[PDB]
């Protein structure tokens, strides 16, 4: 009478990375949403779908709420209601090493990797620069259209940026590394949230609470200097 | 150019306290306004008001926006715009020390005295323990009718209720000790937040980006502890 | 499993107020020594004195530590020892503002009340200006004797007598103040410590690291910023 | 003018590293003094002496105070003063990460390398474990010594081991570290100090009340924080 069951994307590192389902899942999403449902009494279940497919999977009220690095847009916000941020939100270009993309100047008239069901194709438009977006479902397509040049850069989230920079190759000091962050981090929309959909308002109030007691505890502090 | 200015109330510690000029306001709320104001790089210059008067000032453009121990309400979303709450809103009823009302349940057929303005009236009437509201437009004087038993006992923001009960003037241990709680903490409202005019959307969008940043930085942890 | 009993004087803000037998005491050397037992993992039980009391409780093993603004000086080296110190150490001369020494080059030849038991008997008369003192078992009488006829001024801790300048009323702007300073506070002995017997070298010891430890982790910081 | 100056070691990393005649010397014990001397308004000039050189060097006055992560101890104090401690004083057992080594207990009948000068030789003895002291002049030949087979395992300053071992290689992302620490961290002395002649007591109490003031703005936290 007291359990939940979230939904979350199947690979976005450090925010959650899915091994299969018989492996408790791990990220920063992951031991947040944890923290939460125990706070608020309850068993936490997650569920990983391939982060487009989150957004049916909720409505069809498959998973009671959903955390995948969901960024709070007007758009979003027509069909699901969004908790308090737990982040702010911010994207950011990213191409490999032997790129002779350098600046973000350099990014016009080339083509941008985008990963379905975020706001970012819609951003790189928006800049009109000449670039095509090359719409990808999964990152691990986008990371390797991107190893294979099938696409000049990618813009994704930033902390996943950061961590692809440092986490591929391994030693990456010894190696070096295999991407460049190209250009500043760039604001886009109103911060990570929990989404629900509308008749949800009683819980997404009970979770606002709860974030709010997390900040004052140092709970969250913690746990987010722990990953960024 | 960016120069703002405040509106607050001029007596609800540990919100805020305008003593004249000797050292101007000083409170948490000013506090974290001054910091938001830092990070946004932009002048912050405070306006105290009853706090009655914070709304007619704020609908008149007589200031670009209000903190003031605000709590956001469905009733004041008809008219304004928050930011994320910066801490959980929690009313608590107070009393003399030496008053009949021992218990949360004496709370029926009594005068409770309200600050004007907030939402605690309607709190008051929707408990529907056949209480009567009185409505006092300034802090002090809510607390002097109290004590000399206008009003039965006085429901107000949590964290104000425990400053009260912690000195009054400075050591209330000459015969009783002045005030006392009644009843645990009350959730109402969803958070204290900066308010807006609606159409200053742009400038609560930045404010919000802040808050999540001294979240991530620890500076909001610092001076929340540093109060409460 | 230590148990400490600590002696501490009853009344001398912003040190320690022992606001009769409700709410214990409180201040700074209250909150320092707490922490200190915490981390000590002893339990902490303070005993209140009239200030000249502590040092023969002390002496005869009434309690364990002494902590009360209490002065490193050579003299009481004789007979004690005492901890790393906690702060520096100042006095300062203080009067009410209607009264005619205006100047530190005015203290001459004038009655100063001093508070029995410190080293500020002594700074008087060394100072050779030809000045009586006038001994206090209490701080509030010495305080009420600036304006009975009995002394002309007097000397005590800086903080102390910056906080009774700074005090009374509510807000010292809108009625007006009482007391006022006079002269640049005086350096005196080698800073406010916590005492103890000469066979206690090695409570004193666990107590010297914890201090370290204290100022190591922001601890003392946040402790000392939070009253002075 | 006022000139001091100031016998620090040649090399012991995170405290100090002297990195040649025309060559600047930096760490904590350098940033540490040479904020000390602003206050003092005295000039400041450092020379380098091997470790044990330190003592005969004050004693002939040589220079005018040693800071090198010196400890506090009985012996030290009956023929040098010290100001009050700047930072508790630990030490750490320390070997090569292929050693059989691995606890307390296996240190029995080892050879344990120490810096000469310091008080490790009298602190290994007094822990009876049957070990053979071997001395060294220089940490960088003791720690040579120790790879070399000279010596088991080495006692040194804990924060020093500490950096042994987050710099040892630099390109160890998996080459995985050339040292362990065999043991926690062990309590010796009364604290790390600045050292002067008996003689000297004028100077070491400006020092202390300098270093009081340090901790009371925060300047001494922001210094301590950006090495430990």
Redesign the interface.
């Known amino acids: 009478s007291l359990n939940l069951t979230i939904g979350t994307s199947k690979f976005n590192p450090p925010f959650e990375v899915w091994s299969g389902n018989n492996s408790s899942l791990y990220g920063f999403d992951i031991d947040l949403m944890q923290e939460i449902c125990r706070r608020l009494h309850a068993t936490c279940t997650f569920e990983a779908y391939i982060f487009d497919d989150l957004f049916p999977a909720l409505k069809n009220r498959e998973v009671d709420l959903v955390i995948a690095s969901m960024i709070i847009t007007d758009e979003r916000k027509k069909h699901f209601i969004f908790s308090?941020?737990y982040?702010?939100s911010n994207s950011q270009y990213i191409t490999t090493v032997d790129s002779k993309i350098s600046t973000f100047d350099d990014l016009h008239g080339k083509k941008i990797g985008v990963r379905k069901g975020t706001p970012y194709a819609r951003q790189v438009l928006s800049e009109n620069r000449n670039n095509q977006v090359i719409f990808y479902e999964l990152i691990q397509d986008m990371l390797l259209g991107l190893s294979n040049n099938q696409v000049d850069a990618s813009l994704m989230d930033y902390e996943a940026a950061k961590y692809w920079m440092a986490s591929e190759p391994?030693?990456?000091?010894?190696i070096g590394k295999k991407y460049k962050l190209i250009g500043k981090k760039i604001?886009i929309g109103?911060?990570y949230s929990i989404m629900a959909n509308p008749d949800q308002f009683v819980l997404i109030?009970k979770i606002?609470?709860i974030l709010?007691?997390m900040?004052?505890d140092?709970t969250?502090?913690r746990l987010?200097?722990e990953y960024?």
Chains 1, 2, 3, 4 share one sequence.
């Open positions: 308090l941020p982040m702010e391994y030693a990456y000091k010894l604001s109103e911060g109030k606002n609470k709010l007691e900040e004052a140092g969250y502090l987010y200097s960024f």
